[PDB]
């Protein structure tokens, strides 16, 4: 009498989402598991990597309450295996420490080993928290766009705590603002959300990489911050993680004030040519750009061998007001940054020998900075 009935496709999707933060590869390790709990007519799915804590709920039919700790990959495979049933019956047998799955004699049947109930306390986490001091709300569509513009710029090394984080701040006009950088490139993205309270929080980027897969794009997102924790809730999901205790760098000081050289480039053509010249850029990623009044030159060259690719972008796909300038840039940073732009054209502006600023015409919320590479 320890069972529940659910919609197969629904629990498959929710398990797939939940296990996105589960990276362990031993089936005998509880940190490879996720935790499900039947509570009346709801199924609560919990997963954690011991920093990010995730919880989702879906409607089910059941009669008794119970919990099961089960290897996430095996559970996902089981539900995938039965995707041809519209509904499935999941039976928990503590007498065998096994989850058994059937369509809702001689019938298709699955048997999945589970962890002992004694391990559940080691895994379980309760999301009930009044330690949160203040919260804000943003539209999912808006938050998804902001995440898309911010996440890729964070430093990839999680041991570099601060630069691996997304910095939440507020500009002079009191709008919530997000910043990320790895020391060589940086995203600054202002939101539409007006926030009265003080905002000075560093959140590890991983939760945002996780979040962009979870958000449907319709409805609201509630964010809450405490002294030590960050919390999001939306649709049928609740997610939390720890803040980074540190001081984010003074990003405001590096924002360029006035830049002498300004160019306006057709985005589709720029993306296309960068993918071609990339075939002539070596492991250093060093792409040489020459800005002139009439054209932009993209040069990929290997000086040892002489292998070389040169591409030009000219009127009406390129407009330039500035001096003749040759500079080197990490082509991977460049491509990554422009892949999040959605305008017809892109503005690329700089003072000679200094940071490159990328922005969308008539859009002032988003700024991307890329430090050039040394030319010689």
């Amino acid at each position: 009498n320890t069972f529940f009935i659910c919609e197969t496709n629904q629990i498959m999707n929710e398990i797939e989402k939940a296990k996105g933060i589960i990276l362990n590869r031993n089936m005998n390790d509880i940190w490879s598991a996720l935790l499900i709990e039947v509570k009346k007519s709801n199924l609560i799915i919990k997963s954690t990597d011991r920093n990010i804590f995730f919880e989702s709920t879906i409607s089910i039919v059941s009669e008794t309450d119970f919990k099961v700790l089960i290897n996430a990959s095996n559970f996902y495979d089981a539900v995938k295996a039965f995707n041809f049933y519209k509904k499935i019956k999941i039976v928990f047998n503590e007498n065998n420490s096994k989850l058994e799955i059937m369509g809702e004699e001689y019938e298709d049947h699955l048997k999945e080993p589970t962890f002992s109930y004694e391990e559940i306390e080691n895994y379980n986490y309760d999301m009930v928290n009044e330690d949160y001091t203040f919260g804000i709300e943003i539209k999912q569509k808006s938050f998804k766009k902001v995440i898309n513009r911010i996440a890729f710029s964070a430093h990839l090394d999680e041991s570099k705590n601060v630069l691996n984080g997304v910095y939440f701040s507020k500009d002079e006009d009191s709008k919530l603002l997000l910043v990320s950088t790895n020391g060589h490139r940086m995203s600054i993205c202002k939101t539409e959300v007006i926030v009265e309270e003080d905002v000075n929080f560093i959140v590890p980027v991983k939760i945002f990489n996780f979040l962009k897969h979870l958000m449907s794009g319709e409805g609201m997102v509630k964010i809450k911050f405490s002294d030590k924790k960050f919390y999001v809730e939306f649709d049928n999901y609740k997610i939390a993680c720890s803040l980074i205790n540190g001081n984010y760098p003074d990003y405001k000081s590096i924002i360029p004030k006035e830049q002498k050289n300004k160019s306006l480039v057709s985005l589709g053509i720029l993306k296309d040519r960068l993918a071609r010249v990339n075939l002539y850029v070596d492991k250093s990623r060093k792409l040489v750009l020459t800005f002139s009044e009439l054209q932009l030159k993209l040069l990929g060259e290997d000086l040892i061998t002489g292998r070389k690719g040169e591409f030009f972008i000219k009127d009406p796909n390129y407009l330039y007001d500035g001096a003749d300038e040759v500079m080197a840039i990490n082509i991977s940073y460049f491509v990554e940054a422009i892949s999040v732009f959605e305008t017809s054209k892109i503005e690329i502006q700089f003072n000679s020998g200094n940071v490159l600023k990328l922005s969308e015409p008539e859009n002032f919320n988003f700024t991307h900075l890329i430090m050039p590479m040394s030319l010689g």
Binding site: G183, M186, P249, S253, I254, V355, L369, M371, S374
Partner: peptide, 10 residues
Amino acid sequence: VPTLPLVPXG
């Protein structure tokens, strides 16, 4: 590979 003009950091 110069860093952005960050203080502190570079």
